[model samples]
Target chain A: CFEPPPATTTQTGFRGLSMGEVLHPATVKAKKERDAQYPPALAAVKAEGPPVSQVYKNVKVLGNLTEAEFLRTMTAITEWVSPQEGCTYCHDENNLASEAKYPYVVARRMLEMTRAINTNWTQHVAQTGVTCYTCHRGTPLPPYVRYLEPTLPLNNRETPTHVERVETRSGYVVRLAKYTAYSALNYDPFTMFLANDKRQVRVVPQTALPLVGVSRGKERRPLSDAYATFALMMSISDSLGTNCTFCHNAQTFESWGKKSTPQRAIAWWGIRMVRDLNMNYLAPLNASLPASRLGRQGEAPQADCRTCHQGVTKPLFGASRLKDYPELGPIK
Target chain B: MYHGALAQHLDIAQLVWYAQWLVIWTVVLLYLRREDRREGYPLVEPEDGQVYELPYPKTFVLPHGGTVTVPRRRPETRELKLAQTDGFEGAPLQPTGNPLVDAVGPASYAERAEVVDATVDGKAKIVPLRVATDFSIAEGDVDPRGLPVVAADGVEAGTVTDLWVDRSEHYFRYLELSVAGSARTALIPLGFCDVKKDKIVVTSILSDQFANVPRLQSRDQITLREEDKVSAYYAGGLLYATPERAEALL
Candidate 1:
């Protein structure tokens, strides 16, 4: 029953039918009549009860899930994951507080990831939101198939889900979920050619795999190495929300023509900046974070273009988040 | 007055001849010894069996640093001996057909074929592959990129666009190969190919599997983590390449 924040609610200034009569009379009355049929699936939660932080020792991610909701979610979680194995799959019955057990801690981080995916990455998962059952499908370990489908236990009560297939014209295309979005020519950095039987991108024209220059080595690296290197550099597009043409020339990849110097200088400095962040700050944070914070590979968090840039090329859409925090002045 | 026994012993006629001979001999030895080590000194693992014989080749037995060793060298045998024989003799070039178990003796898939360093071991650091006209890699043997690579079944996999060199041995370690129809370039070991001036012939596996060769983690220098992966990729490719002899006949 999740609806998008209504345009009428968010839209400011003198537009639409004032505060008086914006909501569709039919939709409002229908929703009210529907709501009148059942007493809301969700329960009202409060700040105090058995104190979930105390009730479930080592409760990290869902620490604020109410005692009443805790019991319900616990029942639901057990039903979703460990019906036969019981709570022992996530906790030891004898010592429930033991972080020594890996699954308990692993599940905590996974719960955070689930919450994050639901809220933030709305691009991949459209409006009809998912619970653990969407992936779990009556099984533990929640398998993924890389794309979208209308697979749900359909009921007359459930809202209809829509997954549109889109393919934009020209440039670099990234096929994410059910849709394919085009990246601009400047941002298109598919120097790599994927060679699978399933989905191939083997566009080996004369323009392809044609470059001769030094990339920090006297010797020429393998074509694959060079190709993959260029491939990894493409991540800059996603990370910084920029393009390859921003730093490199479209014609001569290793050219010093035009305004390439400042771009290259900034790019090189950016590489070192990320390296410092990963090596100096991010890696050491592992010691401070509990097992619940580390990644699946047990690696400490690392930074890339996204850490500072986010979706913007700079923080606060280049208005600068650093003016107040003078301590972090001029990151270089 | 000067005709005492001490003066008699120091007489010029009696002592000058022997002392002068000693001076001349020491000078002659010192001058010729340096001229011996003058120009283009050392080249290791001579393919042409041409080795530079040093004056103290075997006389240099060092026990000073303790626990370090020269291990073995065979200048005596007709077979060519390595002047630079003090490296971590890691693994052989080719793989045994079975590919089921690991190494028999001291072997690793990631073994490099060079004795990278010894106290006094200095050889040609890096050189390109060439002989006729472009000998000593003059005019730079036409950078191997765009050179055709031929696979067994007439599969023109792609061309050589780049290379990965062994810094220690001074030769191209892996040919960073690119294909006309593949996702990325593949890194094939130099040992696994027959490099000609015009083309590189690989008889081991087909062109399809070539792109799957592991890539470097970094753009510039390959870390040991990347080495382990890239090494394991081609090494594992050996299993299906020789499936006839893959199962032990015994």
Candidate 2:
């Protein structure tokens, strides 16, 4: 309770595969089969039509490059690495119909995957030539050909219909669609991707009266009020990627305005409220709560992760359970 | 011839008498001239070719008593009195032409007396005097011998070892006196010493007591060392460490 309440919701959005799930025999066997025949799968995904030009029409429009320059830049993508082999080969440019409806998701994930692959390739291959396309090959199933089209309607003999209608400046309607089934199946419809690893870093005391008690039920007294304040501060930085100066005044730990100027009057009120809540409620509840209920062990407290993940989606994945996997390290 | 001889004798005697008379008359005239001169008047002699006649009524006589008498001279007496008035009672007096006689006066006689007394043994002693309103012994100019040093018990404290006069202030800053057969020294300020005949009475600490205190050296023109041994000796302890006690003493 000594800590300031976090402004940001604490739940992470994505859930990653756990060690047990990743090590499952069926999962390993499927992954191996998918890797063996990746060429045809990649070709099938690439056969899909070009993705809708969301970034080109909206975000890229703000850049200084002319249309010719922009197109040239896009064409030069081969210099970075071929995306023909990765999940993006199908999920990105190949799946034109799905991208039009959810342009942000496609674009954001593409950017994340691109960064991830580049970082891994640089680490594994040093400066020697290696890239994402060398493995994924435009397929969700690595190194194998796998049909990804959703179950087509019975009356339609054609593969799943994937089409995007783009309006050109010339007042012409252009219908674009991926012709391949593998590309259609690569789409992940879920908004939040939750990782399987979730563990509690800190626990609240049980005996503490809601918030005010210094020592709780039976477990070693929870982290010091000072440490809680530190955690709160760290949470704020993680949420905003900004320093404390963004909200608190430099000289005084108080809320500030849009201009970041300290409002002493407001700060005084806020500080008093925080102090009272910590001393009266949090500290007392902390003493009363049992260590197990407070999530002193690896389990997350009841209200802790769910505090932010009230709905189905969470913003970031937890890293505690994935400590052994260096590939899937701590979340940014 | 006999008559001639008698007449010659008588003439000679008469010549002698006449010569004596002439000498006496000349003496009398000289005396009268001197008296006149003394009274602020001059004597004018007659020429040989001219016959001289004495002026009549030589002395002026007032109709009533010369001394001026005010109307309310006396309450009872009615006797005639001379007017007792200044210069208005007579004619204006004239000056004598002689310079030396004119200059002679009571004031000149007094001036002569001063000159004679001032020149003693052929040398005139002009007293040395101070011009500045406030002056003191200059820093380097101070001689230890010039300052009065005495023991705390009203005894002669012995000769001064050195005098620490503040150069910037040109005053008697302090005096370091040799004490205990020159085995040690004591510093005393002019304020602490009461100058007296032949010796300065120390009304504060004894020379031996001050000698035991630590000595201090000036770091700059104004500041002294915090643990100056000499200063500590006098102060009994570090002054800065115990500012309250030091201030109390001050």
Candidate 3:
């Protein structure tokens, strides 16, 4: 029932050329050329990978190592060594191709290990100290540390690190520490974390801990990569706490000169200076620039250790600095 | 000749100094021109000193009748009427001299009526005039002026809102009346009133003068106590006694 506006035809070019007529011919000619190049009528079958059984046979041995060895190997592959070799072990041309129907089994195991380390790091170590080697230990199984300490008599010299001490607690052993400093001081993530369980940890006189954990992002490419990215994101959030909008905006990077919010503007200036410095000098020094043709053309800059580290080993301690940037005046 | 006159009129330093002063004055004038000089308490109204006097209306109570004297009587035993309006169908009927009567007359009804005299202010004014026996000159009868008249001296002090009768004794147990509007409504004992015309004239002192009279208690306590009593009294075929039973005892 709704009539669209009447199409207005305007003479755009010289010699009384109608714009609509010109566009019609141009579009038809483009489509004809596209169809000639890639015709829908032509029957072409592309061969995919072999069966899941072959892929499983190729990468099945990766899951058989001890947790320590698994952690070490995965960290070496992802952080230090090349990922191509590890990726092709399961995803070779003769192996399974369809990601949905035939999941990359080794990648799946690696993702489980990554999640275990991330959760354990958040629970045991400082909220910032978690890495791939935290729980995986270069192998497939966690190290055998006696969970029950009271049963075994201890010597006077016995002292455990913060991670070891925290992991022994039943409450901390299950998942990440929901109670961050910000959460403890301002919000109540512990209460949100324990609500789903029946036998809840009594955090208060009458209240119980709540269940607050990541429930999404389980189906990304190379599940371990996705999980590592997600863990890194959580780590960033843990560092900033309430100040997360520093680099991330609802849409695009905000300029310090243009930002209206005081906090957001300050953070924008800090992040912008970091990016500019990294682009100028740090990126080249870290040797993180990709070797691909598009990468060399500066299409996408590679991420380096100094991109986030900035002399801060444990980011949760609020040690990162934002210097060498001009102070922006208020924008009217 | 003109150049010589100009040099004599003004030196270069003096000209520059005067120009500087002119510039300062011009700046001051510009600032003064833009100044907002309009000022007062812009938002508030000026106070008017005037005393205010509030007006109050007077209330008056109208009296319609002249005061009448009343007679006082000593404490004496008296027989009271106790009758049921409903005929005794299920229970055994007590016999009276008349066959159709529901209850026999109290043994001292005749003797007490002779002695009881309606009075006001320690002076006797109206005698007992039964509806059945003395219809010619009874209260509520038409006076010589053709007006239905009640005895002015025998005007009851209290107004009855409801009545309560004891079914067991066939006598009214209490008379419920609204006293002072703000005060608790009273439950006057049946013995406090002596019925003359259809109206029951209170014989005892009014509640304002009496030390203690019956009254409704708090609703919660009343509910709790009355529930059982009401249930039992109704079950016992004594529904007529419920109103009096519900009245405040003390």
Candidate 4:
């Protein structure tokens, strides 16, 4: 748990405030070496041939791409997603355009989702749009994607539910709602928060006390929601390999003013961008995915911060793969 | 070769060489270990303040005639003014009160010696221009004294009452001010202020923040520890002065 010294620090705020990112040179040295292991972009191909929709059968997404452009894109995607499986992973060997394969169907939907993110979620992704390689690395499935975890069995001496009041040494009595069965275990935060647009992420109370006869803000929720939200935050931290101070000054976590940085705003939109990916993109693939593609609770694999971040603050060390694959840009 | 014992096989010269190497290696390791414990030795466990170290520390004579010992077992009584968010280890600790004033987080100060820093000649290094009467602002340079100070919020904080000069370095180190709404004087480091044509501007903090700038024990001089706290208080305002400064800019 203790980090060895000979550390380096880059100050972010004023001189004496001591706000900065501390980097362990040894850790970053290995991280840079690991980052070099990812696949490189393929050579560019001219869009001289006729459109793929005119040449190929049953073309749904990326129909605007020329034959050469389409082949180049597909070759890159295949290499990124599954180099060993080749075209057979997503396409039928008999017809090439056949949608009988579940991977093919999912790939078609994912292409549309990628373009949607690049075009609509610019606030989060910016110009460094994601591709299959961002998540897949050389594997068919992203290693860091999440699925809903099933409820755990209650521990011995654990009561199912209870409301208890404990008096502190300071003489203040605080009431606590305890659920021993589930309190110790972490629920699947991605399924609860990232899989929808309606759930609010803000749970910290802004005011010390609620005003009399006034309705509470929607940000306030049950203790379970706070637990789920915190778990999601932890996942974000682990994904980026950063702690809470990276995005927040813990003195006032919910504050959006002096204590907050531009990265927090970027993360604010990132939460929504991930929600869009999980809801509109990944969740709909449940119909095409087999039982093996799902989790123990039958929940489909969903994207989270780690799907792209994978322990780096920036995906692929902020390399712009999108620059090589302009075909992955917005449909517009 | 003689097989009774390992040493029996060795000649007199070989035995002396091997013994010399072993003795030198042991001494080198012990010297390195003791040298590293010159500062922050006898690590105290925070929960119980139980000192942890060996009795291997050595002593050194100072350049200025005082002798000091390394790994000195000074009693630490500083109370932690923070509370953990959870009952487990590795949990984040939040400050119990105002972090800025309490010297937590960004406003933290080092536990430096309380005595005044001295020049090679033993005279106090940093003192007010009134005390260091020999030093003065150079000709053709703007005199900052008596100039009104404004903060990042464009509100007037105070007038620079005096300049604290470094006698050894021959430069102004801090600006002494009788802050607005308070009779007590405060020192803002000279580096933090931008010297303009008319008034001095401090972009790090807001106007009202000057009232809470850490005060010095004496009117004539500042200690090494007090200098750190005063600078930190102003620096902390870059993130904490206004509620909006901490907010997301995007």
Alpha carbon lDDT of residue B12, candidate 1? 47
Task: Write candidate 1's Cα lDDT for A1-332 as tens digits.
Answer: 74554522322122431211133345545534532332122444444676587787677766655677666666556665556567887776788778765556655654654454345433322233234443343334332211111112112124423322222232113332111113222321221221111212222323322244432355434355444444445555544445555555454555554525354555555554444434444455456556755544544544444333433333223232122211111212
Model 4 C-alpha lDDT versus the unseen true structure: 0.74
TM-score of 4: 0.50
Could you give candidate 3's per-residue lDDT for residues B1-250 as a string of tens digits?
A: 1211235556455677899999888766544322322211122223332111111222333232334221222343432234344676554333233211111222111111222122244322221122112223335632221111121234333455544433223343444554543354444444444554355544233223221232234311122222222222222211121234223677
Evaluated at residue B120, the lDDT of candidate 2 is 30
Interface RMSD computed for candidate 4 is what?
42.8
> A8, model 2: CA deviation in Å?
30
Model 4, C-alpha of A325: deviation from truth (Å): 1.0
The parts of candidate 4 lying over 4 Å away from their true place are A150-187, A214-220, A223-227, B1-250
lDDT for each residue of candidate 2 in A1-332, tens digit (9 for 90 to 100):
24343333221112231111112345334534533432221111111233334334454221444444444333323322344443344235655334443323433343334334333333322222122233223322222111111122211223433332111222111110121111222221110111111222234333212342333465345445334344444332322223444344444343234323232333233233323322333333333434532322322111111121111111111112122212222223
DockQ of each: 0.00, 0.00, 0.00, 0.01
lDDT of 4 by residue, B105-134 (tens): 667777777878888888889999889888
Residue pairs in steric clash, candidate 1? A193-B183, A194-B183, A220-B163, A221-B163, A222-B176, A223-B176, A224-B185, B145-B160
Q: Give the lDDT of residue B39 in candidate 2.
A: 27
Give candidate 3's error at residue B125 in angstroms: 35
The CAPRI classification for model 1 reads as: incorrect
Candidate 3 Cα outliers beyond 4 Å, as residue runs: A1-77, A80-239, A243-266, A273-332, B1-50, B53-250
Tell me, by TM-score, which candidate is best.
4
Regions more than 4 Å wrong, model 2: A1-221, A224-243, A250-332, B1-250
What is the lDDT, from 0 to 100, of the residue A232 in candidate 4?
A: 69
Error of 3 at A101 (Å): 25
